[PDB]
Amino acid sequence: YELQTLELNMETLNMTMPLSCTKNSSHHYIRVGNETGLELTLTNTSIINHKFCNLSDAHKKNLYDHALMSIISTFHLSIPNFNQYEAMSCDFNGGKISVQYNLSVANGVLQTFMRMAWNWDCIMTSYQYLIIQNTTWEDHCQFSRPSPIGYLGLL
Amino acid sequence: YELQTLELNMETLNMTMPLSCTKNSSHHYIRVGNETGLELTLTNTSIINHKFCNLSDAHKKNLYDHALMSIISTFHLSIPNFNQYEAMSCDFNGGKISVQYNLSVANGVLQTFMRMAWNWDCIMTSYQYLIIQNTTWEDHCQFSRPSPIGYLGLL
Amino acid sequence: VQLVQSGGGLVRPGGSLRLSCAAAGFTFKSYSMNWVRQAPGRGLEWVSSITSRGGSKTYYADVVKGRFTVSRDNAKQSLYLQMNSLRAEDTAIYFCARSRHSTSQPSYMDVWGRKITVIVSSASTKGPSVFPLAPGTAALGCLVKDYFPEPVTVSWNSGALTSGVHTFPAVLQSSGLYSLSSVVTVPSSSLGTQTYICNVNHKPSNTKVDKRVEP
Amino acid sequence: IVLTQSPGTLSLSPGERATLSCRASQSVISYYVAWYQHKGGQAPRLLIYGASSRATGVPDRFSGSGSGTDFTLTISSLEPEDFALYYCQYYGSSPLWAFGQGTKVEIKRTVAAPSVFIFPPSDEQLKSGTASVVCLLNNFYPREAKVQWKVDNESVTEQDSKDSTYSLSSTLTLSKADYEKHKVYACEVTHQGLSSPVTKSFNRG
Amino acid sequence: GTFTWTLSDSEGNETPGGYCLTRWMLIEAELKCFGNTAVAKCNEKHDEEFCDMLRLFDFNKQAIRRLKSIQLINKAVNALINDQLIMKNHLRDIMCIPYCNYSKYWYLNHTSSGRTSLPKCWLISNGSYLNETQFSDDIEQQADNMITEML
Amino acid sequence: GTFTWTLSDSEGNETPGGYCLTRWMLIEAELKCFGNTAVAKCNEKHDEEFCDMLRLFDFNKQAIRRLKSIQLINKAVNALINDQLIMKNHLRDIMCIPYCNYSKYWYLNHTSSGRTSLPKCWLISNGSYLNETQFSDDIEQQADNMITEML
Amino acid sequence: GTFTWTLSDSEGNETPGGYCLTRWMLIEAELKCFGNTAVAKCNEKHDEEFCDMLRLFDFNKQAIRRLKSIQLINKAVNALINDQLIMKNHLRDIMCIPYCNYSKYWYLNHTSSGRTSLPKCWLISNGSYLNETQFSDDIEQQADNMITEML
Ligand SMILES: *[C@@H]1O[C@H](CO)[C@@H](O[C@@H]2O[C@H](CO)[C@@H](O)[C@H](O)[C@H]2NC(C)=O)[C@H](O)[C@H]1NC(C)=O
Ligand SMILES: *[C@@H]1O[C@H](CO)[C@@H](O[C@@H]2O[C@H](CO)[C@@H](O)[C@H](O)[C@H]2NC(C)=O)[C@H](O)[C@H]1NC(C)=O
Ligand SMILES: *[C@@H]1O[C@H](CO)[C@@H](O[C@@H]2O[C@H](CO)[C@@H](O)[C@H](O)[C@H]2NC(C)=O)[C@H](O)[C@H]1NC(C)=O
Ligand SMILES: *[C@@H]1O[C@H](CO)[C@@H](O)[C@H](O)[C@H]1NC(C)=O
Ligand SMILES: *[C@@H]1O[C@H](CO)[C@@H](O)[C@H](O)[C@H]1NC(C)=O
Ligand SMILES: *[C@@H]1O[C@H](CO)[C@@H](O)[C@H](O)[C@H]1NC(C)=O
Ligand SMILES: *[C@@H]1O[C@H](CO)[C@@H](O)[C@H](O)[C@H]1NC(C)=O
Ligand SMILES: *[C@@H]1O[C@H](CO)[C@@H](O)[C@H](O)[C@H]1NC(C)=O
Ligand SMILES: *[C@@H]1O[C@H](CO)[C@@H](O)[C@H](O)[C@H]1NC(C)=O
Ligand SMILES: *[C@@H]1O[C@H](CO)[C@@H](O)[C@H](O)[C@H]1NC(C)=O
Ligand SMILES: *[C@@H]1O[C@H](CO)[C@@H](O)[C@H](O)[C@H]1NC(C)=O
Ligand SMILES: *[C@@H]1O[C@H](CO)[C@@H](O)[C@H](O)[C@H]1NC(C)=O
Ligand SMILES: *[C@@H]1O[C@H](CO)[C@@H](O)[C@H](O)[C@H]1NC(C)=O
Ligand SMILES: *[C@@H]1O[C@H](CO)[C@@H](O)[C@H](O)[C@H]1NC(C)=O
Ligand SMILES: *[C@@H]1O[C@H](CO)[C@@H](O)[C@H](O)[C@H]1NC(C)=O
Ligand SMILES: *[C@@H]1O[C@H](CO)[C@@H](O)[C@H](O)[C@H]1NC(C)=O
Ligand SMILES: *[C@@H]1O[C@H](CO)[C@@H](O)[C@H](O)[C@H]1NC(C)=O
């Protein structure tokens, strides 16, 4: 005869499953492990201008963090279709991680955004570049509490 | 209200589905049809020294038994994170069958064996080679009663 | 959740006894029950088992088969352990515990109970006798002999001196009566200064004997 | 099943790690193995249920491992209230509840010299019925001690928190008419700290 | 997805439905036929294993007769069984927990009526089988609904 | 496929079944435990959005202890959850309809008995939650069920 | 996976549940309204053909109304329907057994009450629709349910 509400904390499921949260439509957060963190930032500018990258040696050079490559691999695979030209590029020199996508096609990447940190048409955003970067702990989860369904559904 | 037990015989499900059984920790028997047979073994010795082997002519020759190659097809397809680089020691000259690999990456193939006939870390067996062979209708299936769900799990 | 119960005590050889384990605070029928004893000095021993809300499968220890019966009543939620033809090896402390036995849950007794003393004896309680043990640093003692298994309190100088006093727990005897010795150690200076009196108070028969041990 | 613990008694001080071993004979299913704690007055607790698991209200100083016929219970750090009896338990086989024999963990210290005393009977004990003589040792360590009685050449308390050092008594008993035979009686006690045996005797009168 | 196959019944059956295992698919046993009511619980629960074996037996029985390779099951592996039972048992095995090897089962029979329960498979652990006592409550919990089956 | 996992239960529970939820994965609350009767309904419904979270909690609880990467959940995701719920809520949100984000839940407590019912979840739309009145009938509908629980 | 879609309900319906077919949805017929009691059995079954068709009809209504290519169903097909029914019917057709084809259905109408039954689908076999007596017992089997519906 009495109504009650409970809100679940999704922070305990830390390492068993990656998590994700939202500050603003510019950048999305991914956390894996105890501390490992990735930013998915929308920006009109380009921070790297190298013209050649490839994925075979990225897993072949074998000195990387192998628990991290998986999320960007599933991001690369889950996009519906892809242009023959490799507009997207990557760079992992020095151990760092940098994956850039030249938005300026966008339909698939925008639905991937709608799912990773979660009418139907090809409306595009005014931003022109996606940057995929390493980050520190800092704080990206304050407006909305983090959840694991941003990654479970796209597996 | 009394208790009873019954034990199913998987021998009848003979030709509809492949069957598999175990002798010891390094031996596996695969049977399809009525007389054909495959041996899956772990052994420290190399046999085939031919470093060149392609899979296109394997299905292109068409002189092979087309109801058998599918099982080893699913076997090398189900293994995860396979590099497709080298060490593929396949051989089918004269119509025969032979597949072997180096174990010295092995985590995936050992998990494959554990699934195909039945903690979690990168277990390193001391054996160095995996042998695929044709065989005759012997009495391998004696240590444990053969079951078909080993193949169902992989599929 | 906890189990409350009572029972046990002194029973003459050849009698009959009943152990009751009452239950409160959980769904009784959905659990299995165990009766386990602990003899003085050794490890725990099985006594009996019973399964869940069928009363069907019953198991007893290999040693004590036959003289025991175990049953469970769901209406009053009580474990009843009926003991017949008592022997001389039943003196121990009993626990009544509960555990479930399925696929998902491993086996463990979690909600235990209260220990229950059980003792068998031929004679009744008979008041002990107090003996003196007067001798850099020396020691003096009070001994009590011809003593019943029930607990007693023995004290020096009405409890004024509570430092360096050792009371020895009763130990297995031959005749069938316990006994115990207490010793207190003091330096040479304190000798002959403070009056020391051995006091024994024993609840069965309420024997309160106070003997002033002096030369 | 024959199920035993090892070692019989452990002596260690807080700060380091310690291990206890449980061994059986028949093949052991790891999923039905429990580890139990038994202190003085309180009812026994459930330290671990499962081969390597955790209880609801247990500190993180405990861990378990093993397989086959070997079980290792490891405590990485100690506590002032972690010295009592331990047990390893298996469900099934014969009988259904296979409790272990026993284990005990104590504190380590250097050797100490016992204080010895001998108490002979008195003249009033003709009313006692049977003569008794008490050979008493106090404040000795370690547990290894042997007591014997000689003609013409048991009781123990618990380890105390304040001192952690043991006591021992021997109550030699002789029938009244049997005592008037001899006149000199000795009790001797030996322990590893004192290699040379020390024997003390008394003369009737 | 979800399994969709159905029981084909027999000719000499005493009831309209209900499978009856024959002599050739059992070890050291005769032919036994279960009641229709017990089989009626297969098409309404996803946490049972014996009905998967019955579905495979039926599929093979129709395959041998009504048709004269192995792509028949590659195309129909899902329609018969549930892969998540395989996955769940594999996860139980990899965590060193009792699991089910799909080989032998235990059921509960009635001396007079013959009404039987749906068998659940016997559990193993590292090449060693269990005893009856280790899952005693299971053996009795089903017994309870037997009384409830009288209602 | 179909979810197949089972609930582990806990030592020291009022009843054999029933999942008790601790205080390390809640917000502004201590540990909270549900009745076995409410737990009995997860293994029979597919549209419930709550029991998936209990299954994920139990999987993590049993993966932290009896182990020592992330591929485990890659292999177990289907056996744990139902991706069709994710797709259903995605298609419902893309059509601008209130949808459940699996963040907070409402249940019908009972003051004395404590027989809490299985919670559905609060919905959301464009970042704003709802109000108690907007799903009034829902709040009442489950109430009817509890009356039938008296039977 | 499992189907997860729901019912959109109507405005003038007597009962909150239930789905009313339109005249422009049938052939040589009028609009028909099914009771909520009958349609309450779609969410608790997996071997029916009518409820999948209703799910597709609901999805079509919502898609044409609340939006303005074909990838929508390319992504929602698993949610709306169950491919295992397609596999089952295809296997029954390849082995030459009478089978359903999602074209025409049959149900029972109680004239006075107005309560209906879930329409199980008709059967075809190699270009010839079945004749009524062939599945006679089924036509009366569901009839027995109406007796049990009196309770
Ligand atoms: C990463 O996950 C761990 C595991 O849950 C979190 O640590 C828990 O934190 C809660 C809240 O303080 C404690 O009650 C638990 O005891 C902790 N568990 C362990 C194993 O330490 C940790 O907080 C998570 N990381 C972050 C940054 O939140
Ligand atoms: C291959 O499968 C067939 C089909 O079950 C087996 O033949 C059956 O064997 C049993 C056992 O004696 C007989 O009762 C059946 O009548 C046989 N069915 C036939 C002949 O159609 C055969 O034994 C199996 N062979 C192997 C090597 O496994
Ligand atoms: C399992 O048993 C088989 C057969 O009993 C063993 O196969 C042996 O293989 C070696 C070559 O690797 C031969 O020289 C032997 O003649 C085979 N038979 C034997 C040893 O009986 C196989 O080695 C066994 N598995 C293991 C791990 O030892
Ligand atoms: C989002 O917030 C970050 C805060 O670091 C800011 O740098 C960025 O410009 C913001 N973007 C938008 C679109 O508000
Ligand atoms: C990939 O890119 C690296 C970087 O220059 C280059 O050395 C390599 O040849 C390319 N191809 C492969 C197959 O690695
Ligand atoms: C992210 O991690 C890589 C790993 O070595 C490191 O090289 C890079 O500097 C990190 N990025 C930061 C700290 O912003
Ligand atoms: C990104 O795309 C834009 C398209 O407007 C192009 O002008 C620009 O050169 C591209 N950046 C590259 C190729 O680095
Ligand atoms: C990027 O460019 C678009 C149009 O060129 C503009 O609308 C948008 O505000 C720009 N974003 C930023 C962060 O300046
Ligand atoms: C196995 O079968 C192949 C196919 O005919 C044949 O070439 C080979 O010789 C066979 N091996 C044995 C050992 O019989
Ligand atoms: C393993 O690698 C060695 C080279 O180190 C090669 O000689 C041998 O043929 C390989 N064996 C297999 C089975 O691939
Ligand atoms: C294979 O070689 C490894 C490494 O030398 C050894 O440990 C193992 O026992 C060998 N296996 C045999 C000889 O069967
Ligand atoms: C299984 O049983 C064997 C005894 O045959 C034992 O050596 C082994 O440790 C047990 N456990 C595993 C995981 O093999
Ligand atoms: C099962 O019971 C038998 C008694 O016949 C016993 O020998 C065995 O150890 C028990 N446990 C098993 C087989 O795991
Ligand atoms: C159950 O018992 C009856 C009578 O003993 C027997 O006819 C029947 O076959 C038994 N059930 C099975 C499955 O064998
Ligand atoms: C339901 O409410 C009662 C008091 O009204 C409280 O004791 C109980 O904990 C509540 N249930 C839950 C699951 O919190
Ligand atoms: C059932 O019959 C009644 C009256 O005979 C009619 O109004 C109703 O439309 C019928 N049902 C359907 C589904 O047409
Ligand atoms: C139905 O009846 C007609 C004539 O009465 C007959 O030709 C037809 O074959 C029957 N239906 C079937 C499916 O046989």
Author numbering:
A (entry chain C), B (entry chain B): 65 to 168, 182 to 195, 208 to 244
C (entry chain G): 2 to 136, 144 to 223
D (entry chain F): 2 to 154, 163 to 214
E (entry chain b), F (entry chain c), G (entry chain a): 259 to 326, 332 to 414
Quote the original article:
LASV GP is the sole antigen on the viral surface and is the primary target of the adaptive immune response. Each GP monomer consists of the following three noncovalently associated subunits: the stable signal peptide (SSP), the receptor binding subunit (GP1), and the fusion machinery (GP2). Three GP monomers associate on the viral surface to form a trimer that drives viral attachment and cell entry. Lineage I is particularly resistant to neutralization by GPC-A and GPC-B antibodies: many antibodies neutralize other lineages but fail to neutralize authentic LI LASV.
We determined two structures of lineage I GP (LI-pfGP) as follows: a 3.1-Å cryo-electron microscopy (cryo-EM) structure of LI-pfGP in complex with GPC-A antibody 25.10C and a 3.6-Å cryo-EM structure of LI-pfGP in complex with GPC-B antibody 18.5C-M30. Three copies of both 25.10C and 18.5C-M30 Fab fragments bind a single LI GP trimer. The GPC-B antibody 18.5C-M30, which is derived from GPC-B MAb 18.5C, binds to a quaternary epitope spanning two adjacent monomers and bridging their GP1 to GP2 subunits. The GPC-B antibody 18.5C can be engineered to completely neutralize LI. This enhanced MAb, 18.5C-M30, introduces two Arg residues into the heavy chain via the insertion of one Arg into CDR H2 at position 54 and an Arg substitution into CDR H3 residue 100 (L100R). Here, we determined the structure of 18.5C-M30 in complex with LI-pfGP. This structure shows that the two engineered Arg residues form salt bridges to Asp400 and Asp407 of LI-pfGP. Binding kinetics show that 18.5C-M30 has an increased affinity for the LI GP monomer compared to parental 18.5C, primarily due to a slower off-rate. Our LI-18.5C-M30 structure pinpoints the following three LI mutations at or near the GPC-B site that decrease antibody efficacy and, thus, are responsible for the immune evasion by LI: a deletion of position Y62 and substitutions at positions 198 and 397. In LI GP, however, Gln 397 cannot form stacking interactions with the 18.5C-M30 light chain, and by extension, likely fails to make the analogous contacts with 25.6A and 37.7H.
